[PDB]
Structures are given as structure tokens and as C-alpha cells.
Design a protein around this nucleic acid. Sequence first.
RNA 1: GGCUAAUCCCCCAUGUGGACCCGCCCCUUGGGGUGUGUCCAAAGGGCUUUGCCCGCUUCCGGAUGGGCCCGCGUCCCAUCAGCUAGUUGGUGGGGUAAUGGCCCACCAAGGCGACGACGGGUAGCCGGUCUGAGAGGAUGGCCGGCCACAGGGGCACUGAGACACGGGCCCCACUCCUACGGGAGGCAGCAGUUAGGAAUCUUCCGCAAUGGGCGCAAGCCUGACGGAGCGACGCCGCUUGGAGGAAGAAGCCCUUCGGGGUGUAAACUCCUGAACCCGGGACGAAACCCCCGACGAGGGGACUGACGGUACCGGGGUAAUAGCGCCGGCCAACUCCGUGCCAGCAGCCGCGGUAAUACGGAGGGCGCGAGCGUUACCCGGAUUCACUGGGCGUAAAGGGCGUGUAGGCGGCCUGGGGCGUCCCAUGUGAAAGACCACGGCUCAACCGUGGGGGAGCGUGGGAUACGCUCAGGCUAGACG
Lengths: 124, 83, 104, 99, 208, 138
Amino acid sequence: PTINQLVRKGREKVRKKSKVPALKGAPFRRGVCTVVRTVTPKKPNSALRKVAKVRLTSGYEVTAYIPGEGHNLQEHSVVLIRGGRVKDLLGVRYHIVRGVYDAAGVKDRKKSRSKYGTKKPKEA
Amino acid sequence: MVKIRLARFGSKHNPHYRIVVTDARRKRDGKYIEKIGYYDPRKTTPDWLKVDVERARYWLSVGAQPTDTARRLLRQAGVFRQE
Amino acid sequence: PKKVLTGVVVSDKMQKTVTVLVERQFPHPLYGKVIKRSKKYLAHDPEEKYKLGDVVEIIESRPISKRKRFRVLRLVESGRMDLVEKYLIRRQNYESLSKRGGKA
Amino acid sequence: RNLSALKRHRQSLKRRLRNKAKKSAIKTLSKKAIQLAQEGKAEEALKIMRKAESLIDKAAKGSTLHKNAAARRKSRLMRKVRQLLEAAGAPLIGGGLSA
Amino acid sequence: GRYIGPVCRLCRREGVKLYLKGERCYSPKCAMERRPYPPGQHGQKRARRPSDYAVRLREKQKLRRIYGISERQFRNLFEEASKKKGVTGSVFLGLLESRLDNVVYRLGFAVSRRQARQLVRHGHITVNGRRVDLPSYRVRPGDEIAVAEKSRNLELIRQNLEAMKGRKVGPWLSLDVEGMKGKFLRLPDREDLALPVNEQLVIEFYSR
Amino acid sequence: MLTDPIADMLTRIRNATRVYKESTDVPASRFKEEILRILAREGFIKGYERVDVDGKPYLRVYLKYGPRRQGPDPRPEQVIHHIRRISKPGRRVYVGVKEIPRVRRGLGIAILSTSKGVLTDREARKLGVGGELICEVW
RNA sequence: GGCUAAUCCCCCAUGUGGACCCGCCCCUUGGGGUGUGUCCAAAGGGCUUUGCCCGCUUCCGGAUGGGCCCGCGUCCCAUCAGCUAGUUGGUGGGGUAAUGGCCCACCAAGGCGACGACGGGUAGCCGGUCUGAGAGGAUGGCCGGCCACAGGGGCACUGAGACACGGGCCCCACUCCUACGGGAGGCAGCAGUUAGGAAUCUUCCGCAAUGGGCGCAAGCCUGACGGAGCGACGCCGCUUGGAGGAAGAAGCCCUUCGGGGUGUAAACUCCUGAACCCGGGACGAAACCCCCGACGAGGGGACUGACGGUACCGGGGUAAUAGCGCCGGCCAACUCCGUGCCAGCAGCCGCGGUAAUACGGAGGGCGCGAGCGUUACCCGGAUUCACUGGGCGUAAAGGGCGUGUAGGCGGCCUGGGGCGUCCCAUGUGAAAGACCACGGCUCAACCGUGGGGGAGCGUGGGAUACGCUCAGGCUAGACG
Ligand SMILES: [Mg+2]
Ligand SMILES: [Mg+2]
Ligand SMILES: [Mg+2]
Ligand SMILES: [Mg+2]
Ligand SMILES: [Mg+2]
Ligand SMILES: [Mg+2]
Ligand SMILES: [Mg+2]
Ligand SMILES: [Mg+2]
Ligand SMILES: [Mg+2]
Ligand SMILES: [Mg+2]
Ligand SMILES: [Mg+2]
Ligand SMILES: [Mg+2]
Ligand SMILES: [Mg+2]
Ligand SMILES: [Mg+2]
Ligand SMILES: [Mg+2]
Ligand SMILES: [Mg+2]
Ligand SMILES: [Mg+2]
Ligand SMILES: [Mg+2]
Ligand SMILES: [Mg+2]
Ligand SMILES: [Mg+2]
Ligand SMILES: [Mg+2]
Ligand SMILES: [Mg+2]
Ligand SMILES: [Mg+2]
Ligand SMILES: [Mg+2]
Ligand SMILES: [Mg+2]
Ligand SMILES: [Mg+2]
Ligand SMILES: [Mg+2]
Ligand SMILES: [Mg+2]
Ligand SMILES: [Mg+2]
Ligand SMILES: [Mg+2]
Ligand SMILES: [Mg+2]
Ligand SMILES: [Mg+2]
Ligand SMILES: [Mg+2]
Ligand SMILES: [Mg+2]
Ligand SMILES: [Mg+2]
Ligand SMILES: [Mg+2]
Ligand SMILES: [Mg+2]
Ligand SMILES: [Mg+2]
Ligand SMILES: [Mg+2]
Ligand SMILES: [Mg+2]
Ligand SMILES: [Mg+2]
Ligand SMILES: [Mg+2]
Ligand SMILES: [Mg+2]
Ligand SMILES: [Mg+2]
Ligand SMILES: [Mg+2]
Ligand SMILES: [Mg+2]
Ligand SMILES: [Mg+2]
Ligand SMILES: [Mg+2]
Ligand SMILES: [Mg+2]
Ligand SMILES: [Mg+2]
Ligand SMILES: [Mg+2]
Ligand SMILES: [Mg+2]
Ligand SMILES: [Mg+2]
Ligand SMILES: [Mg+2]
Ligand SMILES: [Mg+2]
Ligand SMILES: [Mg+2]
Ligand SMILES: [Mg+2]
Ligand SMILES: [Mg+2]
Ligand SMILES: [Mg+2]
Ligand SMILES: [Mg+2]
Ligand SMILES: [Mg+2]
Ligand SMILES: [Mg+2]
Ligand SMILES: [Mg+2]
Ligand SMILES: [Mg+2]
Ligand SMILES: [Mg+2]
Ligand SMILES: [Mg+2]
Ligand SMILES: [Mg+2]
Ligand SMILES: [Mg+2]
Ligand SMILES: [Mg+2]
Ligand SMILES: [Mg+2]
Ligand SMILES: [Mg+2]
Ligand SMILES: [Mg+2]
Ligand SMILES: [Mg+2]
Ligand SMILES: [Mg+2]
Ligand SMILES: [Mg+2]
Ligand SMILES: [Mg+2]
Ligand SMILES: [Mg+2]
Ligand SMILES: [Mg+2]
Ligand SMILES: [Mg+2]
Ligand SMILES: [Mg+2]
Ligand SMILES: [Mg+2]
Ligand SMILES: [Mg+2]
Ligand SMILES: [Mg+2]
Ligand SMILES: [Mg+2]
Ligand SMILES: [Mg+2]
Ligand SMILES: [Mg+2]
Ligand SMILES: [Mg+2]
Ligand SMILES: [Mg+2]
Ligand SMILES: [Mg+2]
Ligand SMILES: [Mg+2]
Ligand SMILES: [Mg+2]
Ligand SMILES: [Mg+2]
Ligand SMILES: [Mg+2]
Ligand SMILES: [Mg+2]
Ligand SMILES: [Mg+2]
Ligand SMILES: [Mg+2]
Ligand SMILES: [Mg+2]
Ligand SMILES: [Mg+2]
Ligand SMILES: [Mg+2]
Ligand SMILES: [Mg+2]
Ligand SMILES: [Mg+2]
Ligand SMILES: [Mg+2]
Ligand SMILES: [Mg+2]
Ligand SMILES: [Mg+2]
Ligand SMILES: [Mg+2]
Ligand SMILES: [Mg+2]
Ligand SMILES: [Mg+2]
Ligand SMILES: [Mg+2]
Ligand SMILES: [Mg+2]
Ligand SMILES: [Mg+2]
Ligand SMILES: [Mg+2]
Ligand SMILES: [Mg+2]
Ligand SMILES: [Mg+2]
Ligand SMILES: [Mg+2]
Ligand SMILES: [Mg+2]
Ligand SMILES: [Mg+2]
Ligand SMILES: [Mg+2]
Ligand SMILES: [Mg+2]
Ligand SMILES: [Zn+2]
């Protein structure tokens, strides 16, 4: 575009949409489970994927993933939601944080335990 | 009423004052008028006090009022001596 | 220094007051080119001696009305009706900026 | 409870009273004078005007009027009085005005 | 806590003697003679062509493990060098070799750099007549380093200095073994040090 | 009409050299001449001369190239590798003396027009003045 | 309703001086001088009272602090295009410290807008800060400067100053008291409670220091402030040992059963001596005050420490926390076992249906290390809004075509101007931050002293090539 044109018009700064309305971008948000359901992923993958519908302190109802080998969640469980999506499930935008509130850490987890929220064993 | 006084500068347990001309209403470490000197009470360097006396004299002349401690330093630096 | 500006008189129509149109040039802060911008100043003309088309000097003054901050310092050159005309045509061009249009 | 300078408030009221009163005095006198000048009454017009001038300056003495306040009031007074006298003229006592 | 776990295993990963033990590491025990390859299960399997990154990484690691310094310190020290007027590689080496612990090793008060770190931290070392216990203290040219008088009778100090008879310290240093004092005359430059490190690679490692 | 006579001349030169002409004709203006004079002092051209063409003044610019070359493509290295306008009508460019560009690590040149006359960057720096940045050439 | 003092209020005087009207002079917006008329002053207290101190009054000037005014700069939407009756100007008033439509009467009919008026959305601004090769983008916590606010809305009073956070009046919401008439209140001060939240501290010490208010002073006040406490929240420094010690133990892992690995790692030997105990023990504090002098200058002298029995120094002295992420490619680190499109992993491509270096454990390894990871958000990479620094035949992208308004752009020669442009000087560009040097805490973080730099803007001087402008000429463009 001519210099004159840039002078008349100018470039448009490019705004960035948010991947996570955890509302006021907060690193985390507390909420309570509505449903704890399993759901089936998309084409080149098969599994029963563990998921929880949460009402949130934001006033938002969202869908969360429940990472780890097994979970204690159900019903009215209070929970912390951390954001980040499961790729191969449609519309799951956030993860549940193991080891906080009503979601316990993964039983018998030796490798990276700070994810999955489990504490250090004593060597026997 | 314009004053000559100390403003605190160095870190915790490291006091260093600027000897300073400022309106008395100012917070002590806030904007001053002129800096006419400096004072390190712990005398950690060979010069722990310095005062510009032609200027200290100016400010006194136009009615600046020293703090007793400001006064003390200025006297040490001979602002006051008339001989 | 009380600021002096130079302008063309584009308005006769008040009492003891003229409107003085004043151009300004400068490099665009980013795109670099020299751009020309302009502002109308209401200036004090007590003797009503300044006419339309006059190029005058305007001097920063003690406030006179709400939005009269300048007085007319001196006349520079008498009558340039081209500058006035340009102003007028620009104004008349507004006629079609809105829901429809008239003639160009 | 009871932070003890509402003393300041009380005083403020007293002073409010004094100032109000002085101001009233000045205004009623000024009107009296001007209204007299209206009538070509110049002798007592200037007599009153003189009292008023005094009251004004005396106000300026303390916090009632203070400085340019009074000066302005005095000016507007004398201007109006003289302006009214001429238009029927004869500055009889000529008390307050330069000849 | 900068490193402090088995060492000759680093001698072994970087494929070069790092001299982290003092004695031993001279004799035929260093594990470079006696199995010079990486540690662990796969150490003896055929190596694969290293990425540019792997090269730069390992060079950096080599230089760092030599001085025993941490990565945080190493990096800050490096940023310092990059800021200073004059060639970053050289300057970085000079800043590194200027550490008090290092100087205590180079002077031969301590057999190793780790031992020097301890000698310093326990205050058997004096800089300019005054005790200094901080290993990271930067010795400036002209500074005189010595063994504190009360520690002059320590069996290990007497010993280490006894073996220092008839040995020469670096050209940027000078040592009086009779008074147990050194002096840091000049910043050493790359060619004073024999270090098996191409520092261009290190510079290139942070350039990323 | 011709919106940028200086650009036009620079381009005539580029265009001409890319086909290895011995000379080209640019229409004549004093300013153009001053630019040419810089080029010809600097080695980019053999020189130039005032010339009449159909009764109108022109500047015949004599082009200059390198030795003939080996391999496929015998064509010579150009003496003017790069000739480029900076300031144009429609964006004018003025540098202060601290801002005079240094073209191609000194192997190239910039040509400023200053109130001390048309100069090269070196001339301008030594003369301590800035100006309109006309073109760069290397 | 009654008594009463004063540095409380008032009246006359004195008028240095000053204020106002009118004239005159210089000056030029309401600055300075001058004449006549008028108007305007004061407060007393302490002493060793025979003279000093503390004050009071008018005035001129200084210093500091402020008000008001102008140029320029200051986010998104044009799916906001027209806005405007105190509106725009005038005369005369009112108001104020003071200009002003600030307010009012009357008169005129204007003012603003595509160079974005009006409307809507968001937002305290700045020094700076983060990022970036830079240009740029993003931000404005703490520290310093300015603004604004003190439950919400209005208003004034008292003052040099407020339209006043811990002052006053009224309306509204809320809490509490209530003899139902009516009252009280305002932590966006320090702490602390409660609620909301992913989340943010002690109802601590001290007036010793610096600073502030009043006081002749002695002194009083000061949740400013100096400190301590709590939290790896950040940064920096430090420890968990150092030297020796096997062709190399046991256990655990891999195995071609020959062996390989963890590994000098351990054990063990020897040395040092964090922690801890004992002893001494701070700087920060010399003024205010006392002495001589002269309540000055000058000289000399003594009191005062929350932090703290802390830092520090001396003596003694124990081998004395390590974790966290990762090892398919990007990306540094590979094997065994379990699982069999399950369970799971996942930033992207992808991995898992029987050999899985991609799941889970283990061995081993890589990276960091009192931390290591995760989520969020900003810049980066993204030359992916392209000024630096991009494009439009077929990838996104030439308007269906013209006519022309505003605007953008403009051939050759000469002259004046010197607006753009360039150069010099000067002022400004506070402090802090950044940069450089030297220094103080054993180092560093942190801090001190000094130096340099700096866009932009003001003022003076200069240059004239180019751009502008005015004046004249040409004919190669254009038209005839
Ligand atoms: Mg699959
Ligand atoms: Mg102030
Ligand atoms: Mg001295
Ligand atoms: Mg004096
Ligand atoms: Mg003009
Ligand atoms: Mg008219
Ligand atoms: Mg007016
Ligand atoms: Mg005038
Ligand atoms: Mg219209
Ligand atoms: Mg319409
Ligand atoms: Mg009180
Ligand atoms: Mg009181
Ligand atoms: Mg009345
Ligand atoms: Mg007035
Ligand atoms: Mg460097
Ligand atoms: Mg040397
Ligand atoms: Mg070595
Ligand atoms: Mg040819
Ligand atoms: Mg020639
Ligand atoms: Mg080219
Ligand atoms: Mg450019
Ligand atoms: Mg400039
Ligand atoms: Mg260079
Ligand atoms: Mg009574
Ligand atoms: Mg009585
Ligand atoms: Mg007199
Ligand atoms: Mg009297
Ligand atoms: Mg009185
Ligand atoms: Mg009396
Ligand atoms: Mg007396
Ligand atoms: Mg001022
Ligand atoms: Mg109205
Ligand atoms: Mg009206
Ligand atoms: Mg008026
Ligand atoms: Mg108005
Ligand atoms: Mg405009
Ligand atoms: Mg708007
Ligand atoms: Mg806001
Ligand atoms: Mg913003
Ligand atoms: Mg940076
Ligand atoms: Mg950078
Ligand atoms: Mg960019
Ligand atoms: Mg920047
Ligand atoms: Mg901003
Ligand atoms: Mg805050
Ligand atoms: Mg602040
Ligand atoms: Mg409000
Ligand atoms: Mg509140
Ligand atoms: Mg409310
Ligand atoms: Mg309110
Ligand atoms: Mg007062
Ligand atoms: Mg008042
Ligand atoms: Mg108040
Ligand atoms: Mg209030
Ligand atoms: Mg307020
Ligand atoms: Mg309060
Ligand atoms: Mg208050
Ligand atoms: Mg009340
Ligand atoms: Mg209330
Ligand atoms: Mg509070
Ligand atoms: Mg309360
Ligand atoms: Mg809660
Ligand atoms: Mg706190
Ligand atoms: Mg206390
Ligand atoms: Mg105190
Ligand atoms: Mg004090
Ligand atoms: Mg109290
Ligand atoms: Mg505090
Ligand atoms: Mg060992
Ligand atoms: Mg074994
Ligand atoms: Mg193990
Ligand atoms: Mg074995
Ligand atoms: Mg022992
Ligand atoms: Mg002390
Ligand atoms: Mg002392
Ligand atoms: Mg005291
Ligand atoms: Mg005496
Ligand atoms: Mg004395
Ligand atoms: Mg000890
Ligand atoms: Mg000992
Ligand atoms: Mg042990
Ligand atoms: Mg791959
Ligand atoms: Mg990496
Ligand atoms: Mg790899
Ligand atoms: Mg299964
Ligand atoms: Mg994993
Ligand atoms: Mg992510
Ligand atoms: Mg199987
Ligand atoms: Mg398998
Ligand atoms: Mg497979
Ligand atoms: Mg595996
Ligand atoms: Mg993976
Ligand atoms: Mg695995
Ligand atoms: Mg650390
Ligand atoms: Mg980005
Ligand atoms: Mg980069
Ligand atoms: Mg870039
Ligand atoms: Mg894009
Ligand atoms: Mg571009
Ligand atoms: Mg592109
Ligand atoms: Mg197609
Ligand atoms: Mg297309
Ligand atoms: Mg077409
Ligand atoms: Mg169309
Ligand atoms: Mg056309
Ligand atoms: Mg046109
Ligand atoms: Mg033009
Ligand atoms: Mg031309
Ligand atoms: Mg000319
Ligand atoms: Mg000029
Ligand atoms: Mg600065
Ligand atoms: Mg130092
Ligand atoms: Mg700047
Ligand atoms: Mg300047
Ligand atoms: Mg100038
Ligand atoms: Mg000339
Ligand atoms: Mg012409
Ligand atoms: Mg024809
Ligand atoms: Zn070794």
C-alpha cells in the first residue's frame, strides 16, 4: 500500500482470542462436579476417557479431563480446574488437578508424581 | 518554609543521607529542590561528609532552615564559621 | 515566548472575532512522510479591521472568551481567496458524507 | 469517640457569624450609597460611600475580606457613584473622590 | 549445592580427563585409563552422530564441570563477560579463572578445585591479609592470596605445600612456598590455560 | 511527465548496464549532473557528457564493467552492482549527520544532497553535515 | 437566664507605607512613577524588668508552594455521521487571588465535524518496566512525580490554603442504639476480623535514628518512619564434606551366560569442621543541653540504641537435607518387564489392537538443583499488519467501467524568501532506573560517590543542495 495509504489507514494490530475462559485469566478455578462421565474420543483412537462437567466459581459450566490411572471423583466433588485441552476429545478445554480439594493423587505412582499429585513413598 | 535536611538513601542498616534543600511539607525521601551534600554516619569511607558551602550559604541567605542535625553537619563543614 | 502563528481568515461572521485557519507540517512519526494538518483558532479582532482572505499573525493572549486565546498581531498579506475557497469546498463536501449524496 | 477539636468547628461557627455580619453591613451600605447617587444626592451619597469604603477596608483587616477583595469592592463602588453623580453632576461634598 | 556426587563419571561422559580429583586423576586410576566411555548400561554401545545442539551442550558442560561452578553462576558470569568490552570467550575464561577457590587450586594450596572450595569455605585462606570464606570471591590483579597463619600448621597444608617445592605456578601467578603466599599478577588468557574447551562453542551455545 | 527524474536516471543506468550498453542518455538537469559527477569521481562510471538530441539537452553516461569471464556465462561483473533510491517524492528521507548510513561496510556509497552541496557519506561526515538521502550505490 | 479575663471582638488616634476613584508621566493588555480627595494599622507576654528575649502591625522585596492559560503528544468501534442553545461571539454586570459563557441580563447568529466532530467501549497519566538485533509490541505492581477519590450524590462554612479520609449540613443505601419521638456510625491509615478468591502477612518492637506538628525551652505527639515477625514470592550468597580407597565387594539391573552396568559410588582410612556450646561484643550518636565566648562565630565538654546480647571477633566442636522434570522427533538422555486401540499418554505430528526407546514400573541416563515442574498472562520467534520489513494472472487479494471533488504526487532554467531540511551555541530533558568508572558491607544481591549519554521542545546564530513558496523565463509533458 502506498505510503500515503499507510498514513491514511495504517496497519491493524492483531488481537488474540483466549483459549480459556477460566474468566479473569486465573491460573486455576474452583468448581463442583455436575456429571462424572466417560466419553469416547475421535477417529484414530479408541478409549473410555474420563471426564467431569463442572459448575465453576466464574459462573461457567465447562468440561474437564480427569488425568491419571484412576479417580475418586463423582457427583458433588469440589475440584480445581487448570486449563489445557485434550486433543482427541471435542470440547474439553481444561484439566482437573489431582491432589487438590476432593480429587486425590494417583495411587501407587512412582514416576513423575507432581503431575498427578501424589507424594513421595518411603523406600522399603 | 524551605528547609535544609536529611533524606534517607542507602539500604537497610546502610543509612546514607543526602543533605538536601526542600519544602518542609514534602515527604523526606520525595522530590527535593537541590542536593547540597551527603552524609554517611557509619563513616565507612574516608569522606563520610561533603557539603557545598557556597550553595548552603545561598539557601541560608534566602531563608532555608536547617534541621539541628543538618545544622550540625553544615557547621562541621564550616558553613557557619565567619573568620 | 507567547506563541505566534500564521493563518488565513476564513470567517467574518462574529462580532470582534475572526476565525484563523492555520496549517502545520511534520514527518509522520512512523511512516516518515511529511503530512500537513491544520487547525482553526478564534482570534480577537477588536477594531474589526481583518477581512476574509487576510493572512495574519495570531499571538497567544490572555483569555478573551471561552475558546478565544489569541489576538491578531499583524496583517501579513491581504486577500487570498483561494485558501478560503479551499476551506469552503471542503466544508461543502460534507454535504454528502452520510446517508446519500448530492453533486461532487 | 470524641476527637477534641470540634472546637475548631464551634469557632468556625462564631467566625461565620462575624464575617456574615460585616459583609451584610458592607452590602447594605453600598446599595444605600449607589442608590443615593442615582438621585443626584451627591453630598450624602459620598458620605455613605465614605462609610462603606471604611467598612470595606476594615473588613480587609481580618479574614472577612482580605486584600484584592476589598480593593475590587471599593473600585466598583467609586466607579458607580461617580458615574451616577455626573448625569446630574455637582459633586457636593466631594468627600471620597479625587477632584 | 553445586554438584557433589560421583565425579570421575563426568571425566567419563565428556570423553576427556577433567582432573576433578587432584592425585589419583594423575596415576593409572582415573577411569579414563580403565574404561574411558560414558557411564551406564549403554556407554559401550556405538555412538551416534551428535546434533549441533548436543555438541554445544557438551562443550558447555565440560567447561562448567571443570570449574565445579553451578549453572546459575556459570551463566551470570557468562552474561558478565558478554557485556564487558573485549572478546567474550577470553574474558569469560578470565572471569572464571579469577574465582578465589580456583586461584587456591592453581596456587597449589589445595590438590583439587573441590578441596580448594573447602579450604576457602573453612577460612584457611586469606586475601590481602583478611580472611575470605567465599569461593566465588573474585581475585583482582595485585591481590595476594595466602594461608591464614593459624591454619599454616594443618597437616594437609604442610603436605600440599611440601609437594609444591620445585613446581611452577601459572605465568599469571607467583608463589612463595616459604611464606605460603601467592599473588595474582594478571588475568590469565585462553592460551595460558590448556583447557580442552572450544569456547566459541559455548558462546554459540547461549546464542540460541 | 515524469514523477521522479532522479529515480528515472538511476533506473536508466541500471537497465542499461544489465544489457551491457556502452552508454545511455538521461535527460539533462543540473542536479542529475551533480549526481553523475559523484559517480564518475567514485569509479562507477567512465564519465558523462552534455549532448544534444533532437535539439534538447541530455547527459550521455558512459558505462563501465569488469573483465570478461570464464565458464558458461562470460558476462562481466558489473561495476554498479546496486543502484537504488532512498528518498522519493511521496516519502522524503532526511538524515542528520549522526544518521548518515554506512553503505556496505564502506565498500558502497550513499549520496546525500546537503546545503553544502551533493556529497558522498564520507564527504558529508567530514564536512559535518546531513541532508536528503538520495540514493545508495554499491 | 446571670457573672467574667485575654495575644477574643469593636471605636477614635498616629500614616512610614498601602488601597480606591480622577488627572498627569514613562511603559504598553491590569507594569512603574506621581499629584489632590477619601479609606486602612497594631498585642501583648517573659525575664536577673533600666535592657534584652518571645511576639504584634503596615509595607517593599526574596524564597518555597500553588491557581489559571496556550502549542504539541496521549487506546478501540464509522455496524457512532452529522453534533450544538450557554450553544459561538458581542456590550454591560455578577463572582474570584486572578483571565474566562465561570454565572446573569440584553444583542448578534453563530461554533464544531471525514485532519473523524457527536455517540459507544475500555482506561488514572508519567519517570520507567518487560520483551525485542533494532524498529516495534506489551505494561504502568513496588520506588519517585502528577491527577483523582475517601459508603453513593449534592453543598458550603472556617481558613494563607479545603469545598477538607480520622471537619460541618442535606438526600440515598447499609449497620447499630431506641422509653418509637428520635439518635450513633463510615479502616481506599497501622495491625486485625469477615466475605469473595487459585491467592496475598504480625491485632509485634521503638521514638534510638531521619522526617513532621506545637513549644522560649524543658518537652509532648507522630501505626510517617526505623525495625523485627510471617510466606523459597524474587534476587544474591552458602551447606549437605575433602583427600585417599578395587580390573572393583553386596544388593538391584542388563546378558549372546563369556560378561556389561550402577561405580571410587559404598565400606573403610585420614583431614577439615555447617550446626551447636562458652567468652567478649558493636557501628548506626552528636546534636538538642552544659562550659568559656557575646544565647553569635570560634573553642571545649557531657546524656541518649527499638534493632540486640544481634551482626561481628576469639576459644571449643559433630561428616552432618536432596529433590524435581525429562529420556519418539522438535530436544540432551535406552534398555528390561508389565499391558494389548485396553489402561492410558499428548504442546504439535502422533503413540497404545503381543517384541511399545511414546502407556505403567524398574534399571540406567540427561537437565537443573533448595528447588524442579504446571497453569495463566505479556514480548519473542511472527518478515504471520511487513516504517525498518509482505503482498493481489492461477494460492487470500484490482473496485464492473467511467467522470471528476477533497486529498497525494509534479518537467527545464533563473532570482528572492529560508517554512520543511541540515549545522553550531544555549536552556530544558529532576531524582531513582539503565550505561561507565571508582568505592562500602569477607563476596554478591544491595548500596554509596563521580562521569557519560539522551530523543523531544524553547531561545539565539548559520547553510541553501533538495522539498516548499513568491517572482520571471523555456518547451521535451499536456492542450490547441
Ligand atoms: Mg490409536
Ligand atoms: Mg508539597
Ligand atoms: Mg570532613
Ligand atoms: Mg552565613
Ligand atoms: Mg499560509
Ligand atoms: Mg463582521
Ligand atoms: Mg468577553
Ligand atoms: Mg496587539
Ligand atoms: Mg452540514
Ligand atoms: Mg441524510
Ligand atoms: Mg483540638
Ligand atoms: Mg486546640
Ligand atoms: Mg439589607
Ligand atoms: Mg477585576
Ligand atoms: Mg564481550
Ligand atoms: Mg599473564
Ligand atoms: Mg586444569
Ligand atoms: Mg551501447
Ligand atoms: Mg565529464
Ligand atoms: Mg540495483
Ligand atoms: Mg527507509
Ligand atoms: Mg530533528
Ligand atoms: Mg558497525
Ligand atoms: Mg446569656
Ligand atoms: Mg463587663
Ligand atoms: Mg508619606
Ligand atoms: Mg483610622
Ligand atoms: Mg487582632
Ligand atoms: Mg487595646
Ligand atoms: Mg515587657
Ligand atoms: Mg513560583
Ligand atoms: Mg441549555
Ligand atoms: Mg441565555
Ligand atoms: Mg466580562
Ligand atoms: Mg458555557
Ligand atoms: Mg484538524
Ligand atoms: Mg469519542
Ligand atoms: Mg477505571
Ligand atoms: Mg491500557
Ligand atoms: Mg532487554
Ligand atoms: Mg535483548
Ligand atoms: Mg512484529
Ligand atoms: Mg523499546
Ligand atoms: Mg500506557
Ligand atoms: Mg498495592
Ligand atoms: Mg506511587
Ligand atoms: Mg466520588
Ligand atoms: Mg469500603
Ligand atoms: Mg452506596
Ligand atoms: Mg460523600
Ligand atoms: Mg492558618
Ligand atoms: Mg475566606
Ligand atoms: Mg480534615
Ligand atoms: Mg467530607
Ligand atoms: Mg476532595
Ligand atoms: Mg478512617
Ligand atoms: Mg485529617
Ligand atoms: Mg453528627
Ligand atoms: Mg452518615
Ligand atoms: Mg487496616
Ligand atoms: Mg471504629
Ligand atoms: Mg472461601
Ligand atoms: Mg509486612
Ligand atoms: Mg511502643
Ligand atoms: Mg525523634
Ligand atoms: Mg525531629
Ligand atoms: Mg496518641
Ligand atoms: Mg514499615
Ligand atoms: Mg570421597
Ligand atoms: Mg556387584
Ligand atoms: Mg535407586
Ligand atoms: Mg558383576
Ligand atoms: Mg577432629
Ligand atoms: Mg552507638
Ligand atoms: Mg559513639
Ligand atoms: Mg530528643
Ligand atoms: Mg555564660
Ligand atoms: Mg558548639
Ligand atoms: Mg567460630
Ligand atoms: Mg579450630
Ligand atoms: Mg555421611
Ligand atoms: Mg518421529
Ligand atoms: Mg531444550
Ligand atoms: Mg535425540
Ligand atoms: Mg485393561
Ligand atoms: Mg509422562
Ligand atoms: Mg499449553
Ligand atoms: Mg506378554
Ligand atoms: Mg512387550
Ligand atoms: Mg508398535
Ligand atoms: Mg519404554
Ligand atoms: Mg512424551
Ligand atoms: Mg516409560
Ligand atoms: Mg540459590
Ligand atoms: Mg507471542
Ligand atoms: Mg530470539
Ligand atoms: Mg523480528
Ligand atoms: Mg495473521
Ligand atoms: Mg512495507
Ligand atoms: Mg505475504
Ligand atoms: Mg480456484
Ligand atoms: Mg485469486
Ligand atoms: Mg477490471
Ligand atoms: Mg459495486
Ligand atoms: Mg481521472
Ligand atoms: Mg487537484
Ligand atoms: Mg503540491
Ligand atoms: Mg522541480
Ligand atoms: Mg531558491
Ligand atoms: Mg529555517
Ligand atoms: Mg535520568
Ligand atoms: Mg568491593
Ligand atoms: Mg528518551
Ligand atoms: Mg535545541
Ligand atoms: Mg533556530
Ligand atoms: Mg542566498
Ligand atoms: Mg512559473
Ligand atoms: Mg492533435
Ligand atoms: Zn578423573
